[PDB]
Amino acid sequence: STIEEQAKTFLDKFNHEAEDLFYQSSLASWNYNTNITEENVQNMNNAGDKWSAFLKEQSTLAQMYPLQEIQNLTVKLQLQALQQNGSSVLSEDKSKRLNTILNTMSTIYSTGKVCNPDNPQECLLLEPGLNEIMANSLDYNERLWAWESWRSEVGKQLRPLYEEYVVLKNEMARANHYEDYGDYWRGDYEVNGVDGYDYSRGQLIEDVEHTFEEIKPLYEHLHAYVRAKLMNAYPSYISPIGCLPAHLLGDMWGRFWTNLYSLTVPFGQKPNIDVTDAMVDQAWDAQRIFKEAEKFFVSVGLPNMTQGFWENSMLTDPGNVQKAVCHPTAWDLGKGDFRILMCTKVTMDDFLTAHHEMGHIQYDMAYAAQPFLLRNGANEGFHEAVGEIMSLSAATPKHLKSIGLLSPDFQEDNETEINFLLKQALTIVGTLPFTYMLEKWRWMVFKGEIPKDQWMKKWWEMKREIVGVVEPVPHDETYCDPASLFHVSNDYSFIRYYTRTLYQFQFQEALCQAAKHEGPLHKCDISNSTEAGQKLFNMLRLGKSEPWTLALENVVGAKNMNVRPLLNYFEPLFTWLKDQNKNSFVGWSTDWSPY
Amino acid sequence: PNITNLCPFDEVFNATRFASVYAWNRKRISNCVADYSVLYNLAPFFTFKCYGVSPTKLNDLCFTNVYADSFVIRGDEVRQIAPGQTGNIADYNYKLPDDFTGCVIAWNSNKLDSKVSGNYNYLYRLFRKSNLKPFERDISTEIYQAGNKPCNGVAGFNCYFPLRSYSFRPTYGVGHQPYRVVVLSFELLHAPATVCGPKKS
Ligand SMILES: *[C@@H]1O[C@H](CO)[C@@H](O)[C@H](O)[C@H]1NC(C)=O
Ligand SMILES: *[C@@H]1O[C@H](CO)[C@@H](O)[C@H](O)[C@H]1NC(C)=O
Ligand SMILES: *[C@@H]1O[C@H](CO)[C@@H](O)[C@H](O)[C@H]1NC(C)=O
Ligand SMILES: *[C@@H]1O[C@H](CO)[C@@H](O)[C@H](O)[C@H]1NC(C)=O
Ligand SMILES: *[C@@H]1O[C@H](CO)[C@@H](O)[C@H](O)[C@H]1NC(C)=O
Ligand SMILES: *[C@@H]1O[C@H](CO)[C@@H](O)[C@H](O)[C@H]1NC(C)=O
Ligand SMILES: *[C@@H]1O[C@H](CO)[C@@H](O)[C@H](O)[C@H]1NC(C)=O
C-alpha cells in the first residue's frame, strides 16, 4: 500500500526479468568472445540491444518512485542504481553526438597506425609493434621517434574530439545533479544515509592526497634508484638533478615500470623465482593449473568450482580454425553460471593470472544470494583487489614449495627478496603517481579549474611535479597527450587502480594477521587458513548491499583508505633504497635539465 | 499371499512432463499395494527428506489415501518444500502444513527440462495478495495490484502479471537447474485403509 512495498514488488519483477535478459546477453557476448564469427556478432548486438532497451524502460518505470520516503537501505540502494539516467538525460541529438564521439575515439585508438616516414608500403600498429618497441628497445632516438610520432598523430586527431567530449560529459553530469563529470566518477565511492559510515563524493580527493603524501617518499627513493640505473642505460641524456625523460619508462605512457627490471635489477647474478621450467618438465597442463588454484581456494576455506565451470569454461586456446579473444576475463553470466575465458600458456604468469581470475570468480560466486542490481563489488577497487591478493599469495616461494613447483632445497636469501620486491615496486608503486596525476588532471579539466588553452602546460607541469617525469620537447594545445592512453580515450574511470592498489595491501595485512603470519608481509601465504577465508568471505558475501566503508571495516577494521599496509609491504625495499641512495640525489627538480 | 496390483508410481515419477508449481498436479493413490522401496533404491533421486514418518517403516504402515503432488521448481527452492519454510514457493505456489505426515522427493532434471533456447513451459507465481493455505492450488491469472489505482486487467504501472516463467537452460548452476519434486502425503480416514505395502511369507 505504501511506496516502499511498491518498490519491493517492482524490484522483484525487475530482478526476475533482469536475470533472464542479462543471462541471454552474457551468453551471446561469451559466444562472440570464444568464437569470433559474424552471426555471433549480430547475436551479441541483438542481445545487448534488448538489454539496453530493457534497462531504459525499467529506469523509466523506476524513476516514478521517489527515494526520500524509502527507509530501507537495500531497496534505496537498488533504486539508486536503477534510476541513474546515464546519457539518456540529454536531448536525442546530443546523446547521438556523444555516442558518435565515443565510437570514433574507439576507432581512432583501435585503428591508430603510426609508422616511419618514407617507408609507407606497410605500417605498424600500436598493440602488435609499438608496445614491443617501447618495452624492448634500448635506443634513445628510436623510442623518441615512436613516442613523439604516436603522440603527435593521435593528439592532432583526438584533441577536438576530447574538446567536445569534456563539454558533453559535463552537460550530462550537470543534468544528472552532479557538479562535473569528475564528480560523476567520484560518485561510485559516495555513501549516503548510513550513520558513521558516510562517505562523500568530495572527500575522496583529499583522501587520495592524504594517501599520496605518504606514498611520495618511497616513490622518490624508487625514482632516484631508477634514475641512477637509467643513467647506466643512458649516459649523457639524463641529469642527476632532473626528472626522467618520458619515453624511457618502458611503456608508451609511463603507466607501468615493470619493463625496466632488466635495466634496474638489484642483483642480476641471483636467479629469479620463475617456475615455468618446473611446469614444462612435469607437464602441467592448463586444467591442472586451474585445479591447483581451486586447491588453494579450498585450502583457504572458500567453496570449490561448480561443475558447469569445468564444463563450460574454455581454459585453452581452441585452435587456428576458431578465433577467440585471448584476453583473460572472468565471466559471471548469472543464474549460477561462472566461466573463465583464458587462453592459458604453460607459464608462471598464466598461473598467477589464473589465480587472479579465479579470485574474481569466487568474488562473483559469493554475492550470488544478493539481488541482481547489488551483484557487484562494494566499490570499483574491491573486485580487482580480491584477485590481486590471490596473485600475491600464490607468488610466494612458500606456496611454490608447497605445491611442488619450487624445490625444497631452494635458498630464499635477502637478495632475491629485494629483487622480487623491486619487481613488485616497479609494477605497483610505479603506477600510483601516474594514476593519481591522471585522475587529478581529469578532475580539474572536468571541474574547469584548468583553462581550455592551458591543458598541456598544466599536465606536463604536474608530470614534472607529481610523477617526476619530464617531456622530451614542449607540446602546445594542438596535441592531446593524455588521450593517447586506452582508459581516457574510451571513457573509463582511472582512480579504481589507485584504490585497488591500496585495498590490496590492506586486505593482505588483514588476512595475514588473520592467518597468524610471523614474518614480513611479502612472505605471507593465506593457504591452509580457514579463519582468513572466513574473514574475507564476510566481505565477499555482501556484494554492493553494504557501504564499502562497512565492507572495509569488516576486513581491516578501518572504514577509510590506509596507506600503512602498502609501505609496510615494501619496508625492506624501502630500507634498501635508503641505503643505496646515499651518493645519489633523492627527489627531482622541475627544470628541463635532462632534456 | 501372492502379491500383484502395484500402485501407479511409474505414472507419477516417470512421467514425460510435470506440471508447473503454481498449477501443481495432485494424483490420488488408492486400492493398490505401494512399494516405497523402489523410490529409496534409485540413486538419481537425491533428496528424500521425509517428515513425520520414518522411511524404513513406510512398507509396514498402511494408510487410507496417498497424495502425490508433482511439480517442477529450481534448485534453490527445493528447501522451501518443507514444513515451516517461507519464500516465493512456500507463500505463493505450494504450501506444506507444519504437521505434515509424508515425504518429499526431489531430483535434478536438467537433461529433461532444459533447452538451449530456454524452457518457458514452467511458471511460478511471484505475487499474491495473501500467503497460501496448506495444500491450496491457485491457478488464477488475475492482474496483481501493487498500487492504489485499479488495474482494469492491463499490466501497466504497479500492475503485474502474477506468473513468471523459469527460463531453464542446460548451462545454469545447480541452484537454478530444474528439479522435479514429488510430495507424498499419507492420510488416514475412518474408511478401511487400502494402500499398504506387501506382506512377507
Ligand atoms: C564456432 O563457430 C563456427 C561457425 O560456423 C561453428 O562451426 C563452430 O561449431 C563454433 N564452435 C563451437 C565450439 O561451437
Ligand atoms: C529491506 O528489505 C529486505 C527485502 O527486500 C529485507 O530482507 C530487509 O530486512 C529490509 N531491511 C529493513 C531495515 O527493513
Ligand atoms: C532522469 O531524467 C529524467 C528526464 O529529465 C528526469 O525526470 C529524472 O528526474 C532523472 N532522474 C535522476 C535520478 O536524475
Ligand atoms: C566440491 O567439494 C564438495 C565437497 O567439499 C564435493 O562434494 C564436490 O564434488 C566438489 N566439486 C568439485 C567440482 O570439485
Ligand atoms: C643479507 O644479509 C646479510 C647478513 O646479514 C648481509 O650481510 C647482506 O648485506 C644482506 N643483503 C641485503 C641485500 O640486504
Ligand atoms: C595445505 O594442506 C594440504 C593438504 O592437507 C597440504 O598438502 C599442503 O602442503 C598444505 N599447505 C601448506 C603450505 O602447508
Ligand atoms: C522409472 O524408470 C527407472 C529406470 O531404471 C526405473 O528404475 C524405475 O523403477 C521407474 N519407476 C519409478 C517409479 O521410478
Author numbering:
A (entry chain D): 19 to 613
B (entry chain A): 330 to 530
What did the authors write?
Focused refinement of the RBD-ACE2 region resulted in a density map with a resolution of 2.66 Å at the spike protein–ACE2 interface, allowing the visualization of side chains involved in the interface. (B) Cryo-EM map of the Omicron spike protein RBD in complex with ACE2 at 2.66-Å resolution after focused refinement. In the Omicron variant, three mutations are observed in this stretch: Q493R (Gln493→Arg), G496S (Gly496→Ser), and Q498R. Residue R493 replaces the hydrogen bond to ACE2 residue E35 with a new salt bridge, whereas residue R498 forms a new salt bridge with ACE2 residue D38 while maintaining a hydrogen bond interaction with ACE2 residue Q42. RBD residue S496 adds a new interaction at the interface by forming a hydrogen bond with ACE2 residue K353. Additionally, the mutated residue Y501 in the Omicron RBD makes π-stacking interactions with Y41 in ACE2, as previously seen in the Alpha (B.1.1.7), Beta (B.1.351), and Gamma (P.1) variants, whereas mutated residue H505 (H, His) is not hydrogen-bonded to E37 in ACE2, in contrast to what we reported previously for the Y505 residue. Compared with the Delta variant, new interactions are formed as a result of the mutations Q493R, G496S, and Q498R (D) and local structural changes owing to the N501Y and Y505H (Tyr505→His) mutations (E) present in the Omicron variant. In isolation, the K417N mutant displays reduced ACE2 binding affinity, but our findings suggest that the new mutations in the Omicron interface have a compensatory effect on the strength of ACE2 binding, providing an explanation for the similar ACE2 binding affinities that are observed. Cryo–electron microscopy (cryo-EM) structural analysis of the Omicron variant spike protein in complex with human angiotensin-converting enzyme 2 (ACE2) reveals new salt bridges and hydrogen bonds formed by mutated residues arginine-493, serine-496, and arginine-498 in the receptor binding domain with ACE2.
